C-alpha cells in the first residue's frame, strides 16, 4: 500500500511549497495521479486478500472504496476552487492540508490489518472533518452541528474501544485474518450480548439508522462543499466497512439481536424518505436521502447473506458517488443565489440548460433505475431480504415509491416550472462546475458495464 | 454604530473581467491552464486510460479458470457414470464421528 | 414530531440537560473554608466507618 500512502503524505509538503497561485493546479494534478495509481488495486486475487505487509492489506471490499476515495480527492479541490477564492494564502493552504490528511487517514483505515489499527484511524478522520465543518462552514449553526457530529460518533466509538481490547485479551491478536480463521461461536449469555451491542453501536452511528441520525441534517447542511461530499460519500461507508469486517466474530449472536436494529432501520427508511418528501432546504433533502439509502445497507449487512453483502458494497459505492454529486449541485445553486430554500430559485432549466441534464442524471441515478449501480445494489438487497422474510417487500418496495417521488421533487421544483423573476445574478455555468460533475456522473455509467469490481468480496 | 465593520462583499463574476473565464482563477493564464490540467489528467489520463486498465485487468477472482477447471471435472464425472456432485463436501471417510 | 422534536430531546437534549444540572452545583460552591473542611470531616468519617474500607 506504500505506493499510495507515501505519495499522499509526501504530497502534503508539496502543497505547502507551491507558489501562491499554482496551489490548486499542482494539487489537482497529482491528486488525480494518485487516483490513477490507486486504480491498480482493483485486481483482487481469487479467494485471498492482497496482503502487502503486516500493517496493510486489501481485498475485494477495500479496493473499490480506496479508489473511490482517491478519485474523490480532486473533486473537493475543484468544488472549493470558488467559494474559498478570497482568502489569505495560508488558510487556503491549510484547507488543502486538512483534505489531504483526511484522505490519507481513510486510505490507511480501509487497509488496516489490525482491528485496533482500524479503530485509531477510523476515528482519526474526526479531527480533520470537525476542523473543516467549524472553520470554513458557511452558516451560524455549524458550531452546534460540529458538536453534534463528534459527540455522537465518539459516544458510540468509546464502548467500541473497550470491546476490541477485551477481544484482544481473550483471543490474543485482533488481526482481520486471524479473527476469521480462529472465529468461535459467540454465546447468548448477557455478557456476550453487551459485547455485541458495543461491537455494533459504534459502526452504526456513522451508518446512522433511524433514531441516532440527527447529525446528518446538521453536519451536511452547514458544512463547506468539500466537507459535505467527504462526510457523505466515504466516512458513512467507513462506518459500514467495519460491519462486514467485524461481523466475522459476532455469529451466531447476530440473529437474536438483529431484530431491534432491523426493525428500526426498515421502518426508518420509510420514515426518513417521508421526511425527504417535503423539505425546505435542498441540502437537508439530499442529506436525509443519504440516511434512507444508508439504512438500506444497515438491514443488508446485518441480515448476513451472500447476496446481501454483494449488493451492500454495490449500493455503498453508488450512493456515495450520487450523494457527492447532488451536494455539488446544491452548492452550485447556492453559490449563485446565496440561499438554500428549494422553492426560492424555481425554474433553472430555462436559464442553465446543461445544469438540468446533470440534475436529470443525478436524480435519475438516485431513482435507482436499471442498469445503474444503484438499482443493481437495491435489487440484490431486496432479493436477500425477501428470502429472509417474504413480507419485507411491502416495506422496502414501498421505499422505491417514496424514493421516486422526492428524488424527482427537486427536479420539478428547481429545474421545471418558471424562472424566478426577481433573481438576476445567475451567470452561465462555469466550465469548472460542468467538468466536475461529468467526473461524477459518467464514471458511474462506466461502472455499470463491469459491476464485479465493486460487487464486494463475496463475488 | 454597534460595530465598525465592512459591508458584505459582492460575488465577483469571473466573466466581466475576462469573457472566456473557466471558473478556476481570476488570472486568465492560470485558469486556462487549470482547465488544461483538470481535463488532461481527468477524463483521458485517469478516466479513459484508467478505464482500459480496469477493463483489461487480468482474470478477476480466477473466473475464467473456475469454469475451465469445471469442464474437465464434468467430463470424467459425466462419463464415469456417477452423480455429478456428492451431497457432502468433506467426504466422511476421514472423519471422526462423535459417539 | 419524531425527528427534530422527540429524537433530539430523548438522547441529545436530555443528556445535555442532565449534564447541565449536575454541572450547575459542582462548579458553584461557596468558597468558605468552613463548609469545605466540614465536607472533609464527613468524607473521612464515612470512609473508615461505613464504606467499611478498613475491613
Amino acid at each position: 500500500m506504500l505506493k499510495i500512502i507515501i505519495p499522499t503524505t509526501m504530497l502534503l509538503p508539496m502543497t505547502w511549497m507551491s507558489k501562491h497561485n499554482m496551489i490548486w493546479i499542482n494539487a489537482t494534478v497529482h491528486s488525480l495521479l494518485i487516483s490513477l495509481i490507486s486504480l491498480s488495486l482493483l485486481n483482487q486475487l481469487g479467494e485471498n486478500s492482497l496482503n502487502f505487509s503486516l500493517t496493510f492489506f486489501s481485498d475485494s471490499l477495500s479496493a473499490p472504496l480506496l479508489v473511490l476515495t482517491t478519485w474523490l480527492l480532486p473533486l473537493m479541490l475543484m468544488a472549493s476552487q470558488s467559494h474559498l477564492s478570497k482568502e489569505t494564502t495560508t488558510r487556503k493552504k491549510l484547507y488543502i492540508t486538512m483534505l489531504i490528511l483526511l484522505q490519507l487517514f481513510l486510505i490507511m483505515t480501509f487497509t488496516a490489518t489490525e482491528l485496533i489499527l482500524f479503530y485509531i484511524l477510523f476515528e482519526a478522520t474526526l479531527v480533520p472533518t470537525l476542523i473543516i465543518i467549524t472553520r470554513w462552514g458557511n452558516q451560524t449553526e455549524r458550531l452546534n452541528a460540529g458538536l453534534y457530529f463528534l459527540f455522537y460518533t465518539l459516544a458510540g466509538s468509546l464502548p467500541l474501544l473497550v470491546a476490541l481490547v477485551y477481544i484482544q485479551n481473550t483471543t490474543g491478536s485482533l488481526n482481520f485474518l486471524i479473527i476469521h480463521y480462529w472465529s468461535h461461536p459467540l454465546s447468548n449469555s448477557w455478557s456476550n450480548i453487551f459485547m455485541w451491542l458495543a461491537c455494533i453501536m459504534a459502526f452504526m452511528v456513522k451508518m446512522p439508522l433511524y433514531g441516532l441520525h440527527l447529525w446528518l441534517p446538521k453536519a451536511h447542511v452547514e458544512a463547506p462543499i468539500a466537507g459535505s461530499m467527504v462526510l457523505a460519500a466515504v466516512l458513512l461507508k467507513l462506518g459500514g466497512y467495519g460491519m462486514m469486517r467485524i461481523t466475522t466474530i459476532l455469529n451466531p449472536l447476530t440473529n437474536y439481536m438483529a431484530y431491534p436494529f432491523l426493525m428500526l432501520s426498515m421502518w426508518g427508511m420509510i420514515m426518513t424518505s417521508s421526511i425527504c418528501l417535503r423539505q425546505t432546504d435542498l441540502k437537508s433533502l439530499i442529506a436525509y436521502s443519504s440516511v434512507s439509502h444508508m439504512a438500506l445497507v444497515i438491514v443488508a449487512i446485518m441480515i448476513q447473506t451472500p447476496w446481501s453483502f454483494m449488493g451492500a458494497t454495490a449500493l455503498m459505492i453508488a450512493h456515495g458517488l450520487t450523494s457527492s454529486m447532488l451536494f455539488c449541485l446544491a452548492n452550485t445553486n447556492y453559490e449563485r443565489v446565496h440561499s438554500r430554500t428549494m422553492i426560492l430559485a424555481r425554474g433553472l432549466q430555462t436559464l442553465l440548460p446543461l445544469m438540468a441534464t446533470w440534475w436529470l442524471m443525478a436524480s435519475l441515478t438516485n431513482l435507482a433505475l436499471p442498469p445503474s449501480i444503484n438499482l443493481i445494489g437495491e435489487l440484490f438487497i431486496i432479493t436477500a431480504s425477501f428470502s429472509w422474510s417474504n413480507i419485507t417487500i411491502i416495506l422496502m418496495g414501498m421505499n422505491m415509491m417514496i424514493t421516486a417521488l422526492y428524488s424527482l421533487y427537486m427536479l420539478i421544483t428547481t429545474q421545471r416550472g418558471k424562472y424566478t423573476h426577481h433573481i438576476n445574478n445567475i451567470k452561465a455555468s462555469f466550465t469548472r462546475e460542468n467538468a466536475l460533475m461529468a467526473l461524477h456522473i459518467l464514471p458511474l455509467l462506466l461502472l455499470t458495464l463491469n459491476p464485479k469490481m465493486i460487487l464486494g468480496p463475496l463475488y | 454604530i454597534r460595530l465598525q465593520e465592512d459591508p458584505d462583499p459582492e460575488d465577483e463574476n469571473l466573466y466581466e473581467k475576462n469573457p472566456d473565464s473557466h471558473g478556476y482563477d481570476k488570472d486568465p493564464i492560470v485558469d486556462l491552464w487549470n482547465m488544461r490540467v483538470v481535463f488532461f489528467f481527468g477524463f483521458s489520463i485517469v478516466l479513459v486510460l484508467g478505464s482500459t486498465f480496469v477493463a483489461y485487468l487480468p482474470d478477476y477472482r480466477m473466473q475464467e479458470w473456475a469454469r475451465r477447471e469445471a469442464e474437465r471435472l464434468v467430463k470424467y464425472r459425466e462419463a464415469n457414470g456417477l452423480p455429478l456432485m456428492e451431497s457432502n463436501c468433506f467426504d466422511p471417510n476421514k472423519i471422526q464421528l462423535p459417539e | 414530531l419524531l425527528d427534530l422534536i422527540w429524537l433530539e430531546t430523548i438522547l441529545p437534549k436530555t443528556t445535555s440537560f442532565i449534564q447541565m444540572k449536575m454541572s450547575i452545583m459542582v462548579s458553584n460552591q461557596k468558597g468558605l473554608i468552613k463548609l469545605y473542611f466540614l465536607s472533609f470531616l464527613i468524607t473521612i468519617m464515612i470512609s473508615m466507618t461505613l464504606f467499611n474500607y478498613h475491613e
Binding site: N138, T140, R142 | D8 | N28
Partner: peptide, 26 residues
Amino acid sequence: RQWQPDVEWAEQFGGAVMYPTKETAH
C-alpha cells in the same frame, strides 16, 4: 462571507459563570 461571531455570541462566553442561575445571579 461566512457567518462570524458578533458581540452577542461573545456575551454568551462572557459571564462570571458560563451557565447563569439564580444562585449565581449576583
